[PDB]
Symmetry: C3
Subunit: 326 residues, 3 copies
Amino acid sequence: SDIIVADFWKNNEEILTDFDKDSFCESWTENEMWSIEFKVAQTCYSFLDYESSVYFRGQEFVVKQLSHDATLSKDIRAPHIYYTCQDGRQDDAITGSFTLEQCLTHIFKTDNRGFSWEIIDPSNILEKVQQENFGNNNYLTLIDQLLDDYGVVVIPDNRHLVFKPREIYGAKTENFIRYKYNTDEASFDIDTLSLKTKIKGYGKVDSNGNNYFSPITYTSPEVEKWGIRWQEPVSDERYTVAGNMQRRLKLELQDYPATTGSVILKECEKGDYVLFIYEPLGIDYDVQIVAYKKYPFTIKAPEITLSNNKKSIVSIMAQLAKVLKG
Amino acid sequence: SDIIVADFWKNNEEILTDFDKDSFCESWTENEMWSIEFKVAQTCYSFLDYESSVYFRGQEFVVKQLSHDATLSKDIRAPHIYYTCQDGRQDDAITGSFTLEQCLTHIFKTDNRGFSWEIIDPSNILEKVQQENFGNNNYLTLIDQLLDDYGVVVIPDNRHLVFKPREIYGAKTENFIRYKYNTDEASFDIDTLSLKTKIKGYGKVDSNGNNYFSPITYTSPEVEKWGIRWQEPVSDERYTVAGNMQRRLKLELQDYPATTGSVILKECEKGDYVLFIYEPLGIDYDVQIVAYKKYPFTIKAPEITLSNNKKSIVSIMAQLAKVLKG
Amino acid sequence: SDIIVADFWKNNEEILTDFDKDSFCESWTENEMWSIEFKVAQTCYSFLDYESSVYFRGQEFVVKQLSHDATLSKDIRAPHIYYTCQDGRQDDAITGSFTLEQCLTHIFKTDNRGFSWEIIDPSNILEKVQQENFGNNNYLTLIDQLLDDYGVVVIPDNRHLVFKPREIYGAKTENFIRYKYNTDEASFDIDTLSLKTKIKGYGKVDSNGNNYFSPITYTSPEVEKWGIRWQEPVSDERYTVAGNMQRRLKLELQDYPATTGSVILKECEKGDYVLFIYEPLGIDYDVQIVAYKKYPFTIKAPEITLSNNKKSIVSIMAQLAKVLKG
């Protein structure tokens, strides 16, 4: 449980001591942020400043924000080392039918900046995507594109990046929520504003205005419950053949009420599933762990965010704003 | 005055009883929202839940947001049935010189989803608009485009949609405001940040860079009061002939101070006009009813929003934020 | 120190008297706003209303926002006369390799609206920029483009506009801040989220996909301190030759921690430099005066904003939001 701090130049390293244990917070939100924040009061080299590394439970975080007030007090915000990949650019672009492996190779070919990667896909879920000018961006933006293109998640262990198809990210647990109303341990925002039961996927349109392939349709089994309601189609001008489009549609269709909540659950479990039972209507569906907030040096339980909201993290935060406002 | 509630499946229907009469709110804002919200406390089928219909004064509202707290309390927000047209998509697109009637026909040809429409235009104000790829969107977005293209308003009576030219939407009343300053019954934000007196309308430019027609200019009579000040021109690449452009310009020019206020007025009157007399300068101009907020089960007078702000509803809300802040 | 007010029509002019001296505020933020605001209580022509001119220390401000409450009180917000150039449009566009002088001439050729200009560049820093369709916009938007294209600042003296290369805007003062932590007189937000040490500049790409010239690279001397970290490149499709690109890159690279603070300093000094010494790491760099807030009729010292944040004024305000929140 010792925290280690090193200056950017790695000449001063020590155990961090003068920090507020109740301040100390580790926070993660799926594909948005992973950071630690804490407050230190002091009473003589530099160990903790901009660009210092802070080592906590086997992971490295780098000081990017730091306040100075005066004894003296500093409030640190340190994003996980993963986020430093944004310092890298791949200006070169490639076009063609490529695997995730070929794309990741493209990102890091000229300067890997200490990053490595692997793809875990033993069932061969993934397939090629037709890239057009893949590149000309910073490494993080490029990775984020791949996540969307291939239907994968990235799980950083320091600068080693593990990519997995969404299907094998998170396992079914034995946790479940029988939801009748909000409690101390579980509060949810639920709506049907985005409830849809059928969606189309369209590829490229030729110079004559004709489609390369007939659009793909994906229909939820909940079409029986709610009737046909059309989600905005996926339209991807790069696809001249269906490719992974069908799976893309199923990944995107919001065929259950958008449900986002903050819970205390009864280990690391990013992406793990909890069965959500919406009791008033007897409708059962999975919600996933999409965020956490830990105070590891206190007796507080981790605060977990569970969601099935496929739209966006901003849509998820809107729902949580309603949860917090009450 | 009985409210009726039916579940989505129409197997349970009843008179709604356990609701907070002071909570009960009907709100409308021109081309933005129309909803009811209320709170119900309970102490056994499902009647009121997601996708339930709530019938109030001859109109249908559908539960899309619902809170659950615990006795038990639920806060409902139910947009008018009109807004459910967004569940429909017209993926097909059409190009050509079309009437509003032809466009509306296009929207609902494959699946009307229970919607109908009519156009009331006895004076033949409306004309054709040159559409390019009209379609490929949800029904609400398409309708909103038509409102802008043709200079019309839509007035939903449940799923029956009445379209009217802006000229015959709202009549001149005998209400007037002699404005010297803000009172309990009328408070206004007024500015001249967007005050303009002349505007141009441009159509398509050809492959050589030449315009299909010379731009149309519309000059306010207030050019005598304020001098020439140029509004951002209308530019519409679809127009190869003037068409309805001149009228478009007059619909858009903000030739009076942008004036937005919340009033209590001394029936349904959406779009009706109130004469606004800006007393300090002796300048008279019309403001229109663009929103209301009713508490029908209380003795409170409807709160009305009057505006002549042609920019946007966000611009109108900015002004009201100033009214509310004081 | 007499304030003079004239109505828009210039028939009523007088010394302004019934105003709250503590209310009276002059505020400037670099290329964003320059205004006065004040409150007047009254107890009879119109002198002070919408479009009135308010003359303060040799500059003209025009009333655009005005509140009315009731004795009677009015809160005025009056942007500097410079901002009225937005009432002018240059619909015509030009393409070619042009000097700043040729562009400014283009803006004001048809109707100068009382504006004049001059360029002060005795060292001949400025050069031609390849314009494509320069024009078709309001005068302020066009000026703002030129500021970015040519690397210049505009310093309005009423409607006379002085343009200067960034190098000769602001001089080195003898003011310095030895920063260890925040005090009553100086509080700063500092981060390294945008810290970059190398950047590329790209021009036009031809029909075959090849660049007209090899990209230009600019490397900070701080690459020795922080390592190579790539900023988003400048990419300008108009450039078929390097032109002023190298200078553009140096103008844009954020090679020191983004540092924004509110200070009381110990005359007009827009753009003047203060040496910022970040004491904990012994890193010295310039910050510039980018905003002020004055209460000229009080004993309050001007509040100055110092920054070296090259991203945007919104990025600068974000940092100040952190300063204000604490």
